[PDB]
Design a protein around this nucleic acid. Structure first.
Lengths: 141, 73, 61, 149, 129
RNA sequence: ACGGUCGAACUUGACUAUCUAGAGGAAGUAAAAGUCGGGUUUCCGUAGGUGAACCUGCGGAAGGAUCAUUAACGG
RNA sequence: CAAGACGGACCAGAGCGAAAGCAUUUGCCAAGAAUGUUUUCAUUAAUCAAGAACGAAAGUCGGAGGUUCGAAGACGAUCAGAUACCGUCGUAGUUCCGACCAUAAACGAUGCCGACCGGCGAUGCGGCGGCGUUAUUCCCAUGACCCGCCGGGCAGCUUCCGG
RNA sequence: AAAGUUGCUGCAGUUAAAAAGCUCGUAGUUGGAUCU
RNA sequence: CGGGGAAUCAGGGUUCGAUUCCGGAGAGGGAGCCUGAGAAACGGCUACCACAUCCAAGGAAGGCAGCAGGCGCGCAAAUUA
């Protein structure tokens, strides 16, 4: 049982911080290795250069080829696979162009069918995928 | 009582932590000057000091009176 | 040395046989530890390999 | 609950509510004190003096008859020994276990109980150092142990 | 070992209140225990009692009515200022209409409403309803 | 200009830590349909058997499905 | 005749120990719980970072010994593909003495100390009260039984206490 | 914030994650009645 | 960088505070000084280090973490009024 005395504030705060280190979110936030392993470097978005297009197979009960691209981030050079969302949207991307990439949703976790993909593309050649898909703007090269 | 005409006293207090509403025992050491008119001062007896100008690197208080230990005759 | 001990065996014959068994066992434990370490390094290299294979250069185009 | 045992005994004395000297006890306090003096001259602990007075002389409680307890009467007269009774017996027990362990080397049970008796000795000496019955520099040593007894 | 003899007393009183017994024997006794039971008596909660004097710590025989729901000690005796008494009587008492934080102050041992009247603070001992 | 002082910075080894070029080594991946092709109740610790698995030795667990019998005991 | 091992049945939900554990007689050695007490001291205590003692089996260094059993190992049997099971033999080990090792389903898969909340009669130890039977009708106390109570124990049964 | 899923208020540890093999022991924490 | 404070919140709490108010610190990096009531000042000076400007090749001049503006950097921020 818990110590409950009047002069036990040191034991209580010491025990709380040691046992705080056993939480998954607390350790991911405060130990410093998750921020050094994060490709985005703790940023909401990052810009990169497309290296390859790649077709990634959906996890077992779904059967599809999810269209992704392999990008290399500008600021650190780390390599990323990023999903291109809507249908036909892969045809807007060519090789070696700037791509703005955001998170997919689950803060570093794979989302849905796509295995190992944490990222989705947001912009190509500084026009959004949404305006390109709905035909609101055109991309230069 | 190991330095030359200067002693080391400690002061004990309780520091309050609001989140647990409790205390922790904390202490601070102090080198103070002991004049030779307080002879046969022993370890563990209570001493009353008063603030004066810095006399050393670490000495800023001067012993004003000494009361013996709670049991010492 | 699969030599059963004779009832006529005396000292410095049983002692020699026992010492031979001890030194055989020490050498065999040493190379058992060596094989454990080698398999450990190989397994770590193979897992680095598989993780790299999943991360990049795996797909269609 | 014992301090070093898993047992929980209830064996102890129960003083009566009547704190008065009984009528049939025809002893003054002076004669009881003198009896304590001669029993100390024979050479005994205060516990033994209390037992001898209880069994043979009808003195149910010495401090109800004299108004003081036995070791205080001894100390005021000057017949109390320098180290206390319970501590002296603890040291004597530890000395006996030490002698037995110098005899027998493989006895681990004796080594365990020896550790327990040493711990009792240290706790009692700590208490008597606080109360200033022992000198502050008193210490139990493994080597100079039988010199005290 | 035994610490907090008030805790022992209040626990034995509660455990006989749940079983519905008519009398409780609490041992050992104290001045703090006697002042607590007096406060519980003056609100009609505990009922009239006896102190048995053995020449050791006494015993108390408490006659019970079926009125006490919970009898409790708060340990340690936290320092309760008058500005923080409201949070205490929100945490411990079931209603704003009944129930009592017993606290000891330099005016004596009282309940919280008397401490509001006498304008003092103290240390928390318990609560009963 | 002598000397002192404060003192940037330099040179040389050690201890490092980083950045950046690299002959070669050892891999996988995609392209070659090319060539050849029965047993265990469930465990624990330790040791051996080619690392582990698994099996055996030794000591432990149940976290494994109690039927039947039981009054005399004296001469 | 010898050697080394092992102490069955008696042996129980009986006992003892901090746990691991502990069963042939006798003697020594020093400890120990409980109980009894109108003895003594008078708070000396609880739980414990650090630090220490002990810690099954297996294992490892030195010496001694090797009866049994027996990992490894040798054979024999067994099959489309058998390399574990099975039988005979057998090394380290299993035994002792001095060192290390510090692990177990090291279990109640259940911290320790204190308090309160229902009942019951069996048992182990200690103590108390009491008719009787027995020691070939015991001459007195004493042991063995029998009936009740109290205290700490190992357990059990019963319960719509409450969870 | 929801998270009483960090718990002082206020969690948990037989079978779900979890009580150290055992005991001693210092610091630390806690400590029985008793005086208008 | 610290405080004042901010977001959230039953009660207890968790998190933020580069940032206009108060305090400190520093002007590319160190170090030394002159003057002066006050500076180890940099929209003062003297070196060294790292950058870098004009040269007739001897020499000379530098310091936007002021306002505007530019490059670079990046997911990320205004007018040379």
């Amino acid at each position: 049982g818990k110590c409950r005395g009047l002069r036990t504030a040191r034991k209580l705060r010491s025990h709380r911080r040691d046992q705080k280190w056993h939480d998954k979110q607390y350790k991911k936030a405060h130990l410093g290795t998750a921020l050094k392993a994060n490709p985005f470097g703790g940023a909401s978005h990052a810009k990169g250069i497309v290296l390859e297009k790649v077709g990634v197979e959906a996890k077992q009960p779904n059967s599809a080829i999810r269209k992704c691209v392999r990008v290399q981030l500008i600021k650190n050079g780390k390599k990323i696979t990023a999903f291109v969302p809507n249908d036909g949207c892969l045809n807007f991307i060519e090789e070696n162009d700037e791509v703005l990439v955001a998170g997919f949703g689950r803060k570093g976790h794979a989302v849905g069918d796509i295995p190992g993909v944490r990222f989705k593309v947001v912009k190509v050649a500084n026009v959004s995928l949404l305006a390109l898909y709905k035909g609101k703007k055109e991309r230069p090269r | 009582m190991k330095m030359q005409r200067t002693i080391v006293i400690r002061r004990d207090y309780l520091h309050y932590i609001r989140k647990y509403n409790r205390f922790e025992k904390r202490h601070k050491n102090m080198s103070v000057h002991l004049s030779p008119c307080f002879r046969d001062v022993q370890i563990g007896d209570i001493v009353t000091v008063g603030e004066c100008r810095p006399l050393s690197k670490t000495v800023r208080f001067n012993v004003l009176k000494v009361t013996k230990a709670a049991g010492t005759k | 040395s699969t030599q059963p001990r004779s009832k006529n065996e005396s000292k410095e014959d049983k002692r020699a046989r026992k010492q031979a068994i001890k030194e055989e066992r020490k050498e065999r434990r040493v190379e058992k530890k060596a094989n454990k370490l080698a398999f450990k390094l190989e397994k770590r290299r193979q897992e680095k390999e598989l993780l790299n294979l999943k991360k990049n250069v795996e797909g269609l185009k | 609950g014992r301090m070093h045992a898993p047992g929980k005994g209830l064996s102890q004395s129960a003083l009566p509510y009547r704190r008065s000297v009984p009528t049939w006890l025809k002893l003054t306090s002076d004669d009881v004190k003198e009896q304590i003096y001669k029993l100390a001259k024979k050479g005994l602990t205060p516990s033994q003096i209390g037992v001898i007075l209880r069994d043979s002389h009808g003195v149910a409680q010495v401090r109800f008859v004299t108004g003081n307890k036995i070791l205080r009467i001894l100390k005021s007269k000057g017949l109390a020994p320098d180290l206390p009774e319970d501590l002296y017996h603890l040291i004597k027990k530890a000395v006996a276990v030490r002698k037995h362990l110098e005899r027998n080397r493989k006895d681990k049970d004796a080594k365990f109980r020896l550790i327990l008796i040493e711990s009792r000795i240290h706790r009692l000496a700590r208490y008597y150092k606080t109360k200033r019955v022992l000198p502050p520099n008193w210490k139990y040593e493994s080597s100079t142990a039988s010199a005290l007894v | 070992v035994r610490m907090n003899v008030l805790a022992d007393a209040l626990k034995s009183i509660n455990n006989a209140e749940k079983r519905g017994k008519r009398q409780v024997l609490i041992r050992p006794c104290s001045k703090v225990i006697v002042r607590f039971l007096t406060v519980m008596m003056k609100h009609g909660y505990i009922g009239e009692f006896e102190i048995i004097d053995d020449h050791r710590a006494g015993k108390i025989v408490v006659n019970l009515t079926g009125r006490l729901n919970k009898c409790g000690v708060i340990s340690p005796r936290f320092d309760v200022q008058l500005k923080d008494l409201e949070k205490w009587q929100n945490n411990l008492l079931p209603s704003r209409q009944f129930g009592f934080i017993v606290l000891t102050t330099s005016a004596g041992i009282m309940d919280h409403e008397e401490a509001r009247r006498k304008h003092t603070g103290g240390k928390i001992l318990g609560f009963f309803f």
